[PDB]
Design a binder for this molecule. Sequence first.
Ligand SMILES: C#Cc1cc(Nc2ncnc3cc(OCCOC)c(OCCOC)cc23)ccc1C
Lengths: 271, 124
Amino acid sequence: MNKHSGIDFKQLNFLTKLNENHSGELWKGRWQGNDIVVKVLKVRDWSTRKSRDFNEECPRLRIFSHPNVLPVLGACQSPPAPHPTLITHWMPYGSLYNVLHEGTNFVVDQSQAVKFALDMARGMAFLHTLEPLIPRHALNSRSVMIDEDMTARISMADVKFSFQSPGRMYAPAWVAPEALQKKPEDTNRRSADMWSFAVLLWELVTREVPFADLSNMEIGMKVALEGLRPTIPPGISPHVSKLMKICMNEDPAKRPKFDMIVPILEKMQDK
Amino acid sequence: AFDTLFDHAPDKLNVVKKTLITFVNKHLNKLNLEVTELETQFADGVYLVLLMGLLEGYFVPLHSFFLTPDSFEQKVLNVSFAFELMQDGGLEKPKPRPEDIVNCDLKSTLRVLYNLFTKYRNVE
Ligand SMILES: C#Cc1cc(Nc2ncnc3cc(OCCOC)c(OCCOC)cc23)ccc1C
């Protein structure tokens, strides 16, 4: 018998569709007394091999041990489900991207932004203790969720699976230059994540989407081959400027570890 | 259907070739790349890969294909990969073999480009 049967697709109450795109569909729903989001994955040439791989890759995402990590609650195996499906808790404020760039009601203040930064750094430090690392986990403002008490949480549902096309990057503005060009096995993945955090810091400082005026293909080509970088903002504190520069070091080996920037961010807290 | 536009309206074939050059340049110019010659400039697969990312809104990591292909085999791999990206985007599996594009088969090239044009005319 299999160790996990996963979540029973029939037990999902689909309420309202939230989005549909290249990778599949996102629904708000209910399951066993939980308010959830359901990601229905669209996969070309689904196979028994890919289904087996999905079912081996999902259990790693069920991380319940850290406040700044949002677990996958479970997954529907396909077969018997119509499609491979992931379930997570519904996060009332949506993604960090939504809160920073699409917030029509209020603008989060910079004390809250620093708390978001600390939250993300703590969750990333925890994820970087895992052996092996969770593969194909890209950090950007769409893959961080904001919970009901404004806690930022790294979303484990936003990993890419082995059967999802490694050849299509949809958020290159947050990806380290070396990771635009080299296979993950040829990069230090933890160092690449720190670049992404540096871009998150830039986003929290400017309240702008990085390279918003350029297409994704433009961004990746210019960052990889032409040295395009975010411009350090004018008139910010020297301490913040210094932190952003060291996290965005051109040399991956000189970038700090997340567990070294956690105490730095702690000291920039109000409390 | 496309072969009537190819053969038995040679001034329309030139209109198709003029329309396709306009279209691919609207996107590739954003990378500081210019196409003047459909019969050769897509044969090594690079511009097809770059064009698909421009049309469907993603970057293609440079480890995923050969940006500067050094052999017939690498060009075939580039075109094959570009064909996969097209299918990822909703197009049916292209008719020509990837070798047909690398060999500068003029008909195979405009059929692939025109199907891109049919689908992505209005992409800005
Ligand atoms: C499984 C899974 C999975 C879930 C997500 N995304 C979310 N995860 C958790 N909670 C969310 C809450 C959202 O709305 C909050 C209301 O904000 C005002 C939300 O908005 C989507 C757009 O809605 C029009 C997305 C959420 C992404 C990727 C995967 C694979």
